[PDB]
Design a protein around this ligand. Structure first.
Ligand SMILES: [Cu+2]
Ligand SMILES: [Cu+2]
Ligand code: NA
Ligand code: NA
Ligand code: NA
Ligand code: NA
Lengths: 620, 620
């Protein structure tokens, strides 16, 4: 009955039938995106209307369409034709990936390049990558993928160990034309294999690891109702899944005595960009928008019990649409479990004689996605003490190149002749805030140093200052780790028992933001990534920091255009957008498969409660 | 047989007997510090000599002594009389704590102050705190403690809820004289209790938490030999314990194929300072050097199975000396166990068809200490992939004051009339490095942004730069989070298979350093805390960043004086000193007992291995 329930296979089948009967899903059409729309603000009328947003591609060259459908009423609400040279191309289709390798295999220029290098075309894998927007005028309004080549010596070989540098091709995947083949010179193909299951590389496996058994004899402490509604240790939330964003958290709230207190209305990772820092023309165009261009949810892994998720695991299996509108289940795509998290609070008091220890735990909601060579885990954590944390886990195989003789300022050497270009992995968290309700404001908090003098005669004092962000034009903020800068989201109309506004504090990791020149194509298309924090006024259509159609969009969409409205954000319905990321200079230890590295952020209560919220935790 | 073995009760009894027979341990003497000395450099002659360093206090006013004893040979090696006005006072003795409250109870000025506030002297607890060095000329060369008062309504009451503000006393604990009683005015004593086990405050305890059972059916994967030698998943180390520093890690090494490769010779937390930022004269002198003044090891907790340490736990019970030289066991003072740590590496490859997942684990070595109101956990972690991490966990009860009517720039309000002064918790990690041996160097690594132009026509390139620190005068470094600054410790004489020097990278949390005015007493006495990173040339006598005798030392001892030697550190035996800490603006949620907050650092391999060191981890 909940409007936030996961899409069902029956809903997706009805969307398919509605589109087909309306004449919108002929044999030349493909669904590039399908997802449920959230309830609009003011859904307190119970008049549920389950609506789906659909992007429809046409493989014959006709204009694509954006369509909204009401499953409840069985009708098409709107259908608009898209001019993609203006507003951007649709996301990349899984079926277009294989088109690239097949088309290049019959192109005389590609074959000539492979022949010069003595490579068998049957052994050459092509990584099909998004194109971006650069100097090529013929690409405007066409769907282009660019291809980089890797050699697979045998069917189980890791092709990533054998990059074919000096060679790139561009392909129009609708007209099935190879537009350009660029060959800048022959590099030796690195010869060492990278097969991390080969006993010749691993050596004998360790026999020293003894089992760690994690069980819950009475079952888990959380409950799941309505398919996706979670209650756990005073937390309440709904777990959504969207094919673009992946796991989305709705209606995060905390039961404080008799009141269910809202904290976050919607939390998601709304974009993620992987820009490469190698100036070689073979790779200087290379930027992945994993969320906006590829859709991270559709590549979610099925997670294996005991390997991917350890303990007493509860799975969700979300349903998405395939390119023809058939429902497809991602079996065991979302893991949920609780974890012991060490000591929560401890004190041994000499005067009272009381010794007190309590243990902490966290609730984990996670999924994993695989896009080509990289694998990313997305982890949301809820803690007993009111802390909310997100963590991204990056692993997989690093993207490779030749290592030039004489070295490089922009590429690490991993093995003889084998390089790995420098790059970043940058995320945007979209936090539709609802601290005790929707009237919220953001303050920037800096530590303040004080000079020795009158009123500070011993020179020990220090303080802090808070600056309210009042309008969108002043709400684009940078980190300052040296001044301990944090941001507080508070509700000026809701006070704790000390008559102070209730709030939550955002703690960033203060990692570098986008490093590219501000005049670059990627800085224009990923402007969100150039600043640590943005605050906007909520609006239904302002969903992604990069806009709706990221693929081959010329730039400026999303956050820079939203904030030009300069709206009031002082005690209003607001959205916080936090940029955070990893700057990756690959190390030898990252090869041939990379150990996990992590980045994230957290929010902690700041006078939200009237005292510690975990006094009622039992001794265990 | 190992020279790094823990001190035994028999060794400490022999030290006592050697001191007593030499005439150094009469009835007026107290042992303020006793610890084993590490082997000097070049102990490859097997000629073991177990030596102990002892600080001896005299309760009659005679000069204290520093004494070195050889248990092996049963002799006093040296005994030097100390001039404490010059080189500092000895650490505070546990038995001096109770002297303060008892002496004030019979002082007419103290009694007059308590009478004006209608407080029963029998209910007034006095926190005995270290004195520092300020404007009081009569304190030079005397052992002073300062006392702040709290009301205990009944024997099990938390006195911290009832600070008596406006009142402080100074006490000479040797002559048993109250030197000064300062009363700046009557503040109301906050009346709400802070008893976190009182059902009236906790409410009914939760019944919702189901058990999490963590067991190891075949026992743990590590072995313990010689009392304190650990082998675990290719790691090898010795776990030491010192009454001043607490847990010390020796001889950290990694078994890479057939070679035992050293990484860190000695790792410890060599100082920790808690400076308060309230300019009130009642508290503006307040700075704890928990390690150097109080000795954190002697207040280590006995850790309870299932509450403090969960899982298959192996305990060490270190032995220390009491003030008379009797051995005292800290039962179950050190926990050791391994923990599952999520996904180690994962990739699902489309081209090869191979799906691969491996799990991570870490080895945990931890202890907890309690000094007055604060409790601190010290955690060392070793990971499968070669990462070494330290984490400090801060909990306990915050130090309180009155909350002034009309507010404060330097104090948080926690409850009606109850304040908590701003403060920091700053740690110094001393890392005696031995990356593949003792010829090491430190490089500072910054991200380098590049401008769009020739050779970077698309403006996407970025790079990094490394600066070698060649002499001590240039090796005092500051964090720069915005440029991704890290430090690499490498061995220029040991190369990986790519002919690059092997190294480890230090990743800091980039939290603010000491905030006090640089002209303050605390900035002079805790100069280490004003900078993020120091590198010195190893020397036997350069043990602590604050010097040997921190209590009431006028300033400048330790790191600022060491680095004035300006020694060569480019490919030499070096020591890295890393400052890191928490800046604490107390929140309502910290009251009446504080949930854990954490800070730390980590070191990750950087071309130390020839490829990932965890390829031989089995599928589990
Ligand atoms: Cu990477
Ligand atoms: Cu604190
Ligand atoms: Na355009
Ligand atoms: Na909002
Ligand atoms: Na002095
Ligand atoms: Na060293």
């Amino acid at each position: 009955a909940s409007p936030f329930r996961l899409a069902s296979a029956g809903e997706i089948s009805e969307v398919q039938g509605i589109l087909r009967t309306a004449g919108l899903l002929g044999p030349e059409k493909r669904i590039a995106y399908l997802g449920v729309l959230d309830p609009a603000r003011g859904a307190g009328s119970e008049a549920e209307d389950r609506r789906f947003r659909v992007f429809i591609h046409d493989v014959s060259g006709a204009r694509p369409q954006e369509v909204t459908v009401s499953v409840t009423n069985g009708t098409v609400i709107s259908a608009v034709e898209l001019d993609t040279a203006a507003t951007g191309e649709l996301p990349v289709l899984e079926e277009e990936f294989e088109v690239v390798e097949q088309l290049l295999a019959t192109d005389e220029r590609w074959l000539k390049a492979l022949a010069a290098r003595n490579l068998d075309v049957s052994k050459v894998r092509v990584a099909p990558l998004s194109a971006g927007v650069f100097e090529y005028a013929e690409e405007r309004g066409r769907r282009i993928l660019r291809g980089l080549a890797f050699v697979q010596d045998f069917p189980e070989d890791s092709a990533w160990a054998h990059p074919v540098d000096g060679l790139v091709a561009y392909v129009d995947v609708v007209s099935k034309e190879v537009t350009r083949v660029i060959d800048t010179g022959v590099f030796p193909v690195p010869a060492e294999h990278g097969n991390y299951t080969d006993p010749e590389l691993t050596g004998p496996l360790r026999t020293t690891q003894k089992p760690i058994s994690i069980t819950q004899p009475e079952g888990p402490s959380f409950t799941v109702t309505g398919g996706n509604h979670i209650e756990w240790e005073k937390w309440s939330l709904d777990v959504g899944f969207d094919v673009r964003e992946g796991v989305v958290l709705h209606n995060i709230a905390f039961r404080d005595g008799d009141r269910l207190r809202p904290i976050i209305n919607r939390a998601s990772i709304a974009e993620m960009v992987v820009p490469y820092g190698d100036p070689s023309p073979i790779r200087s165009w290379q930027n992945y928008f994993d969320t906006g261009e590829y859709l991270v949810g559709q590549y979610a892994n099925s997670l294996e019990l005991g390997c991917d998720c350890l303990g007493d695991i509860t799975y969700l299996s979300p349903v998405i649409s395939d390119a023809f509108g058939n429902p497809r289940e991602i079996r065991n795509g979302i893991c949920m479990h609780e974890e012991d998290w060490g000591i929560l609070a401890k004190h041994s008091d000499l005067w009272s004689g009381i010794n007190y220890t309590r243990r902490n735990r966290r609730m984990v909601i996670s999924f994993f996605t695989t896009i080509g060579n990289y694998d990313y885990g997305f982890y949301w954590y809820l803690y007993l003490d009111g802390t909310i944390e997100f963590e991204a886990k990056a692993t997989g195989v690093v993207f490779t190149s030749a290592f030039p003789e004489g070295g490089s300022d922009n590429i690490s050497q991993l093995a003889p002749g084998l390089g790995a270009p420098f790059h970043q992995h940058i995320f945007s968290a979209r936090l539709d805030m609802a601290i005790d309700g929707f009237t919220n404001r953001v303050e920037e908090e800096d530590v303040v140093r004080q000079t020795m003098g009158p009123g500070n005669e011993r020179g020990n004092a220090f303080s802090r200052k808070r600056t309210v962000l009042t309008r969108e034009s002043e709400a684009v903020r940078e980190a300052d780790a040296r001044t301990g800068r944090t941001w507080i989201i508070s509700n000026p109309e809701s006070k704790n028992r000390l008559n102070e506004p209730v709030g939550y504090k955002l703690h960033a990791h203060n990692q570098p933001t986008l490093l590219a020149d501000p005049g670059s194509s990627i800085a224009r298309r990923a402007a969100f990534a150039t600043k640590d924090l943005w605050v906007t006024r909520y609006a239904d259509d302002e969903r992604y920091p990069t806009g709706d159609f990221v693929n081959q969009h010329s730039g400026g969409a999303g956050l820079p255009s939203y904030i030009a409205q300069d709206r009031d954000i002082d005690g209003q319905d607001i959205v916080v957008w936090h940029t955070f990321g990893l700057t990756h200079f690959p190390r030898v230890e990252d090869w041939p498969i990379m150990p996990v590295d992590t980045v994230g952020f957290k929010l902690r209560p700041e006078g939200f409660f009237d005292r510690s919220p975990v006094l009622d935790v039992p001794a265990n």
